[PDB]
Amino acid sequence: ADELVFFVNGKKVVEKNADPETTLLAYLRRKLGLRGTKLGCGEGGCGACTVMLSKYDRLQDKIIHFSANACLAPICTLHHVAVTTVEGIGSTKTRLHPVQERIAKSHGSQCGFCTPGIVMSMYTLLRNQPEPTVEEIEDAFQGNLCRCTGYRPILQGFRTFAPSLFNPEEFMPLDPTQEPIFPPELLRLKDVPPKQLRFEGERVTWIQASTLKELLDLKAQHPEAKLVVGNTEIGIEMKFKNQLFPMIICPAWIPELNAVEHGPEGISFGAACALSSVEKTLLEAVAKLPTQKTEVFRGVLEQLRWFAGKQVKSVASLGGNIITASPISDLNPVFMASGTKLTIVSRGTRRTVPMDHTFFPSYRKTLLGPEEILLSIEIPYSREDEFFSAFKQASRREDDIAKVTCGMRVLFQPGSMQVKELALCYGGMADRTISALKTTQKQLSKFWNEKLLQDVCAGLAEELSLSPDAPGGMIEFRRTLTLSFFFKFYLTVLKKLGLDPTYTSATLLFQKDPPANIQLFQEVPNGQSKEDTVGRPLPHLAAAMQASGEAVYCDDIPRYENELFLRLVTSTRAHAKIKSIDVSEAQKVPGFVCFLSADDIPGSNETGLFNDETVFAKDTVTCVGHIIGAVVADTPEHAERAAHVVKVTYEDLPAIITIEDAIKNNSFYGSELKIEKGDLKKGFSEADNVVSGELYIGGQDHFYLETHCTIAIPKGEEGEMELFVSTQNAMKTQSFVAKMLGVPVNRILVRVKRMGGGFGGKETRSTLVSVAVALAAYKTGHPVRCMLDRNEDMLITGGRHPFLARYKVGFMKTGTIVALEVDHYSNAGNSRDLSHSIMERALFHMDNCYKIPNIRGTGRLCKTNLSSNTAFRGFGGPQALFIAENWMSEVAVTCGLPAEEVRWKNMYKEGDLTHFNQRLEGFSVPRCWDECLKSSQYYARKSEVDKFNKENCWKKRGLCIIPTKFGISFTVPFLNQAGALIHVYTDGSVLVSHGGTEMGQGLHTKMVQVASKALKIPISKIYISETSTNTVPNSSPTAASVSTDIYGQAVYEACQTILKRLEPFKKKNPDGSWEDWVMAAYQDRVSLSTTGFYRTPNLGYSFETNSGNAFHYFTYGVACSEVEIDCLTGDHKNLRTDIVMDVGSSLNPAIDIGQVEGAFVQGLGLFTLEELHYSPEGSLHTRGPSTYKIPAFGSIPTEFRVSLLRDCPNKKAIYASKAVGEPPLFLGASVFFAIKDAIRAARAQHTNNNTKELFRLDSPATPEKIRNACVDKFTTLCVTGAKPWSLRV
């Protein structure tokens, strides 16, 4: 094998044993020790693994820089390429690059797991364009995800490259002259003639062909050889599709596969040309050539806009997408409809043929022969009287799989409207790209008119049929899109041939609007010391290190020379008996160490919050993903492969998947929960109107950028074990590990530095991985670790609880509520976990901010064969609040009154009691309400929304303003306790330790701010290193948004103890320094170490007597959002959001606004974009960012404004502040109801005339539900055009 030679951050790397299967990410992290680059999904979607690649382009005779996903880039494609990671551009040890500095100072980093990847995308842009426009900056992140920030801070800080939270004036100017030089050695190796290289790995042989002749010989010589260019498809096949290609040929170097020729018929691109090049070349052609000649080009470009991100487009080859021939390819429909020419060659043979319906004979296949390879693709110039359109619709605009995508071309007779040629090619309607030949054939010689339109739609409705079990589901939506797409095409061609003003917008291609961001908060007292940072926008203390990639996350911790890897073995059945396990083939995998099961457990196999779970499945599995055992091996790949071949024999059992199956089978956990106040009977009797209905709200995957991870170190003495875990509950991790091992708790030490996101997903379910790794450590005596891949995490760890509600509300014509009844049902999963408390918080919030005199709420936990669901930011509150706002919205419509009016009149007032009889003191919703109305200019915009709806037939705008209140405190009284430990060393430096953990919310930053203020010393003298069970024991999980409140108090008390001890010395030496008082105290033998403790007073609610305080106080807020839906596709824009939040006297406005935006965006995702799909048998389909869509940079409100309520000190918490972690999440629902408002405008447009109609809209309001709800001539036709002999009169 030849040597693989490339560079990393200027340093030359010579790999003599390069394995074709090794990815750059694995190499950087496990071989080069550069852990700044992270694993977030492994499938090109999160961008957390983003790096920059540089190389001398021989054909261009220039050095080119471009981003790329390390997780998908085979190091074998990098021969003579220069890699640049986040560590190569700057660090806190040296100097931060402007990119790293700005994202950190702008509060663009919270948990920080995504920061390096985002930094590299921005950096790569700057290396291509030193002074980019706002648009270029925004597009640089099509392929980067962030779960914590809400994206606003990141974009606002980065736009600077084109009181306040930050000051751009302090930002260091970008200076290209000071950027790292291209490796001088590589520039010399360019004069050297390229040579064929060969790399040999454990299972794969890789051949880097240098010439076309070589490639053709290789293909002839080895027909089975798999070609690879960008590997963005093959990596997925090998990684997720369990594929193995013994031989691989990379033709990336060949000149012919990279040439770009401008001919008379069109533009020719070599098959290896990256999509970013095709996109750049085509954009150029469109700018210079007549519009009439670039119809197809513009079609290609429109698809490329929403085609993955910069990372993928920079390596993804044109030929690769074509040959992969996926049914939902966005390019093939366009190439087919246009007759794009393909030059196919083999040793000897050669031919150029237009692409047509026959090029794809079957699923993921093409007409190419085994020895043939796609040489080039020529995209045609459009001719006169020839028009083209390309459309795509998915769940999210950015980087997503098309539900339906297409290419549409029409050629008329010279200067006429008479069809000579018509091609409608679709993706997402078959197991391949298809052309509706039967439909279009009937229109040849016909004229472009209404009749043709009706005919085509009827034709499509009948020819493009979908069985009810069609892969991808969403049958109705898809068929509707095929017709809506043609309609858009029909109108666009009419326009082009030259149209009602109210139809015009339907022909417009997506146009992003100019962003606008404003944050408002209160300045601190004029006489406040510069060293007292309480109330100031101090950046997250680890933000600079997060931006540089120096911040250490669990897997970044180096491995011991003898550290092994664990891979969980899980059930592939929702409910079945385990008849036997066969590890015979696993034992054959190199590096196999052992297979662990329940019988290996020395202590107890009974785990879980309520001891209703197994550590390892025993005789029976109760959900797909149920952990049966685990394989330990010498490397991650080896453990994965062995685990994959472990054969489990099951015997299925009756399963209960859905909430419906549960209710009918009486499958519940415990008994019914209920809160009832007043007289329902007398309530409904006094009601003028009564609305009854059913409402559903889907689940949610936390999607913390850092998945579950645990490192367990077995000491070998007295059962001692030290674990490094990504968890919010060091206490339970410790007790559960000990219970499993069967040793005292004092033997187990759990350490938590930070989490790349938790969101409740790491409050209990982190133990599923921890206890298993601990067992492996115990059994092997070796240290063991395991970080979950995204698909494992999504499948096993549980998520937010899906809710089903059955409500009945009674109200007067005035809109006043007089009676309410709601039965909540949650899908809890295969164990109790936190389901019961979640239902409780749900019931505590079924009132939101409205006084309902007669009320009854109930809840039931559905016992099902699904991974156990757990805590998720909101903890049941969001579901209950959503249900409440749903019936409130129906009340407004029914009474024919303005929603804001109905909400306001029903709203609580100072001193009122909730349904659970707790007095509302300091009820600030009215203030947030009025300021939000005013600052958002609600009324004025209200009239402008109506106007827009009158001038637009296929696009509507909606506007909604909703309030929220969130009870602060664990509803389990004993959890409201916090401890802290403080040490003042002799140099005067302080080390603070407390029970809370850091997950990006800035808990430590705030604790240092507090300690600094309490002790009256600069924050520079204080430090918080980690959370550990041997410093602060019996800690509650970091949750319920009360960490700042309670640890703040514990830290405060410990500080007070310190001050009392130093007082004597302060009096003896008044002009002395803190250092002098500390040293004198030490000399005098006075202890400089103390614990601190807080216990939230007066808490204890009973559901039995409906009495006692349930919360310490409530955090309030109001959000007003406006949207614009596309009645024909389901897509929509979040035009503007205005938020007013009451967080009392913020301890840190920067972090608190960050929390508001982050929560808001997470709620936005819950109510409008995120959806998990399960097979009827209970098997999750959506196991990655590719199919599960969380908010992207482009998903946030274009105009995003946040204000923290002024002068609202909360005497109930540390320094008059308020919890902010979860309270704002529900406000994201404002976007949901704005959308429903827009949908009602659409229905009143094409559906019916019942101004008081009450159509059901469940969450999430995805493009599917939005489009399906916009009933029109097309949706209708998709049913009737898909009858009975007789029909009763």
Ligand X SMILES: NC(=O)C1=CN([C@@H]2O[C@H](COP(=O)(O)OP(=O)(O)OC[C@H]3O[C@@H](n4cnc5c(N)ncnc54)[C@H](O)[C@@H]3O)[C@@H](O)[C@H]2O)C=CC1
Ligand Y SMILES: Nc1nc2c(c(=O)[nH]1)N[C@H]1C(S)=C(S)[C@@H](COP(=O)(O)O)O[C@H]1N2
Ligand Z SMILES: O=C(O)c1ccccc1O
Q: Which is nearer to ligand MOS, 355 or 1219 (CB)?
A: 1219
Class of residue 1210 by CB neighbours under 10 A (exposed 0-12, middle 13-18, buried 19+): buried
What's the min distance (Å) between Cβ of 251 and ligand FES?
A: 24
Q: Which is nearer to ligand X, 1021 or 1265 (CB)?
A: 1265
Query: Catalytic annotation on 1222?
Result: yes
Q: Is 457 annotated as a binding residue?
A: no
Q: Interface with ligand FAD includes 842 (CB under 6 A)?
A: no
Distance CA 318, CA 136 (A): 23
Distance CA 805, CA 808 (A): 10
What's the min distance (Å) between Cβ of 708 and ligand FAD?
A: 22
Class of residue 430 by CB neighbours under 10 A (exposed 0-12, middle 13-18, buried 19+): middle
Q: Interface with ligand Y includes 1043 (CB under 6 A)?
A: yes
What's the min distance (Å) between Cβ of 1220 and ligand MOS?
A: 12
CA 657, 659, 664: angle at the middle one, nearest 5? 95
Q: Is 987 annotated as a binding residue?
A: no
Q: Is 1208 annotated as a binding residue?
A: no
Residues 1149-1178 that bind ligand Y (CB under 6 A): 1155, 1158
Supply φ then ψ for residue 401, to 5 degrees.
-80, 130
Binding mask 265-304 for ligand Y (x = CB under 6 A): ----------------------------------------
Q: Interface with ligand Y includes 1040 (CB under 6 A)?
A: yes
What's the min distance (Å) between Cβ of 704 and ligand Z?
A: 17
Q: Is 46 annotated as a binding residue?
A: yes
Binding mask 856-895 for Ca ion (x = CB under 5 A): ------------xx--------------------------
Q: Which is nearer to ligand Z, 966 or 1052 (CB)?
A: 966
CB-side exposure of 979: number of CA atoms within 13 Å?
A: 16
What's the min distance (Å) between Cβ of 400 and ligand FES?
A: 14
Residues 562-591 that bind a second copy (CB under 8 A): 562-563
Residues 94-123 that bind ligand Y (CB under 6 A): 110-111
Residues in contact with ligand FAD, total (CB under 6 A)?
A: 30
Instruction: Tell how far CA 10 is from the center of its chain.
Output: 33
Q: Is 330 annotated as a binding residue?
A: yes
Q: Interface with ligand MOS includes 1151 (CB under 6 A)?
A: no
Distance CA 707, CA 759 (A): 12
Q: Is 307 annotated as a binding residue?
A: yes
Binding-site member from 1090, 1146, 1155, 1259 for a second copy (CB under 8 A): 1090
Q: Interface with Ca ion includes 828 (CB under 5 A)?
A: yes
SS3 of residue 868 by DSSP: coil
Q: Interface with ligand FES includes 42 (CB under 6 A)?
A: yes
Q: Interface with ligand MOS includes 873 (CB under 6 A)?
A: yes
What's the min distance (Å) between Cβ of 125 and ligand MOS?
A: 35
Quick check: 801 and 828 in contact, CB under 8 A?
Answer: yes
Distance CA 933, CA 937 (A): 6
Residues in contact with ligand MOS, total (CB under 6 A)?
A: 10
Q: Which is nearer to ligand FES, 613 or 763 (CB)?
A: 763
Quick check: 741 and 602 in contact, CB under 8 A?
Answer: yes
Q: Interface with ligand FAD includes 320 (CB under 6 A)?
A: yes
Q: Interface with a second copy includes 983 (CB under 8 A)?
A: yes
What's the min distance (Å) between Cβ of 798 and Ca ion?
A: 7
Tokens at 603, concatenated: 């202590």
What's the min distance (Å) between Cβ of 972 and ligand Z?
A: 4
Residues 45-74 that bind ligand X (CB under 6 A): 45
Distance CA 1, CA 249 (A): 14
Q: Interface with ligand X includes 231 (CB under 6 A)?
A: no
Task: Annotate 800-867 with three-state secondary structure.
Answer: ECCEEEEEEEEECCCCCEEEEEEEEEEEEECCCCCHHHHHHHHHHCCCCCECCCCEEEEEEEEECCCC
Specify the pairing of strand 709-714 against strand 855-863. Answer: unpaired
Binding-site member from 196, 211, 281, 324 for ligand X (CB under 6 A): 324
Tokens at 282, concatenated: 């085509």
Q: Interface with ligand X includes 1148 (CB under 6 A)?
A: no
Quick check: 480 and 428 in contact, CB under 8 A?
Answer: no
SS3 of residue 774 by DSSP: helix
Q: Which is nearer to ligand MOS, 575 or 732 (CB)?
A: 732
Q: Interface with ligand MOS includes 1040 (CB under 6 A)?
A: yes
Distance CA 668, CA 903 (A): 35
Specify the pairing of strand 748-752 against strand 721-725. Answer: parallel
What's the min distance (Å) between Cβ of 1090 and a second copy?
A: 6
Sequence-distant (≥ 6) Cβ neighbours of residue 167 within 8 angstroms = none
Count CB atoms within 10 A of the CB of residue 389: 27
Active-site annotation holder among 890, 931, 1157, 1222: 1222
CA distances to 66, 126, 318, 325 from 273, in Å:
14, 23, 6, 17
Distance CA 801, CA 761 (A): 12
Sequence-distant (≥ 6) Cβ neighbours of residue 221 within 8 angstroms = none
Distance CA 681, CA 662 (A): 29
Instruction: Tell how far CA 208 is from the center of its chain.
Output: 36
Binding-site member from 324, 343, 465, 635 for ligand FAD (CB under 6 A): 324
Distance CA 89, CA 493 (A): 50
Binding-site member from 20, 40, 44, 1263 for ligand FAD (CB under 6 A): 44
Q: Is 716 annotated as a binding residue?
A: no
871 touches, from ligand FES, ligand MOS, a second copy, none (C-beta below 5 to 8 Å by class): ligand MOS
Distance CA 74, CA 81 (A): 12
Binding-site member from 51, 328, 695, 1159 for ligand X (CB under 6 A): 328
What's the min distance (Å) between Cβ of 144 and ligand X?
A: 13
Q: Interface with ligand MOS includes 760 (CB under 6 A)?
A: yes
Rg (CA), the chain: 31
Sequence-distant (≥ 6) Cβ neighbours of residue 593 within 8 angstroms = 564, 631, 632, 633, 634, 780
Binding-site member from 68, 148, 1120, 1166 for ligand FES (CB under 6 A): 148
Q: Interface with Ca ion includes 835 (CB under 5 A)?
A: yes
Distance CA 18, CA 250 (A): 15
Distance CA 897, CA 917 (A): 30
Quick check: 70 and 25 in contact, CB under 8 A?
Answer: yes
Binding-site member from 8, 48, 325, 755 for ligand FES (CB under 6 A): 48
Residues annotated in the binding site, as ranges?
A: 41, 46, 49, 71, 111, 114, 146, 148, 227-234, 307, 317-321, 330, 374, 392, 728, 759, 763, 841, 873, 875, 971, 1040
The residue ranges that bind Ca ion (CB under 5 A) are 828-829, 833, 835, 868-869
Residues annotated in the binding site for Mo-molybdopterin, as ranges?
A: 728, 759, 873, 1040
The residue ranges that bind ligand MOS (CB under 6 A) are 728, 760, 763, 871-873, 875, 1039-1040, 1222
Active site residues: 1222
The residue ranges that bind ligand Y (CB under 6 A) are 110-111, 148, 757-760, 873, 999-1001, 1003, 1038-1044, 1155, 1158, 1219, 1221-1222
The residue ranges that bind ligand FAD (CB under 6 A) are 43-45, 226-234, 271, 307-308, 312, 315-317, 319-321, 323-324, 329-331, 373-374, 399
The residue ranges that bind a second copy (CB under 8 A) are 33, 558-563, 718, 720, 744, 746-747, 749, 783, 973-974, 976-977, 979, 981, 983-986, 991, 993, 1021-1023, 1025, 1028-1034, 1082-1085, 1087-1091, 1093, 1095
